[PDB]
Design a protein around this ligand. Sequence first.
Ligand SMILES: [Mg+2]
Ligand SMILES: [Mg+2]
Ligand SMILES: [Mg+2]
Ligand SMILES: [Mg+2]
Ligand SMILES: [Mg+2]
Ligand SMILES: [Mg+2]
Length: 160
Amino acid sequence: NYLERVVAINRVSKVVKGGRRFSFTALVIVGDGNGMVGVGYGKAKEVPAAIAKGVEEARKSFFRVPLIGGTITHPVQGEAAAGVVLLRPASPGTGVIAGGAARAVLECAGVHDILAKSLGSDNAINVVHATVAALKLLQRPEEVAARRGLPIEDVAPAGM
RNA sequence: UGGAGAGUUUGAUCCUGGCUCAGGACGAACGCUGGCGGCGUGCUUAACACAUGCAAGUCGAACGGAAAGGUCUC
Ligand SMILES: [Mg+2]
Ligand SMILES: [Mg+2]
Ligand SMILES: [Mg+2]
Ligand SMILES: [Mg+2]
Ligand SMILES: [Mg+2]
Ligand SMILES: [Mg+2]
């Protein structure tokens, strides 16, 4: 009962003595669609083994995302090795606006209102890494309240 | 109250970095097709040259006079 989507599929080549060797790497994003998201690179000779390894790695690397009612709390600006993607909270009426990789990761996480744009490299893996990094630097208002004190210096009009 | 990406350098990879695309818009033209109504718009080029008709007249309660109208008048 998980939601999975593949982001990029490509074939690699390595030169051997007698000829050519091929292999398949397929990044797969897995989640339950509410708050859980997983990232798996994966690599094998065949595409089924590759996406199976990607799914397994995503299950292993599942990580928690902070939500405030279907949207993120405050705008964030992550950066991968080369990917640069920023995320901003949006009105509940607005859907999810993002590219391929970013939208796949966000929809596996379970975000319904988000504004995402890519400003760095256009590589799918780096875009995914930048998006998940931004999700990591995303924090919780309750956590920052624990950090400072007096959990009143925050705005949560939606609440719930 | 509002931010999408895709293709393309390599034996395969990551960057940098060009080129192309997906969208909208117009006092528009072309190709094909073509029922109607509401509302708008229509020489963007030669401030090039123009046949022709109409686009600034009015007052007799300012004035001298009577061409015409009906007119009493010979
Ligand atoms: Mg770029
Ligand atoms: Mg490019
Ligand atoms: Mg080489
Ligand atoms: Mg070369
Ligand atoms: Mg770079
Ligand atoms: Mg006069």
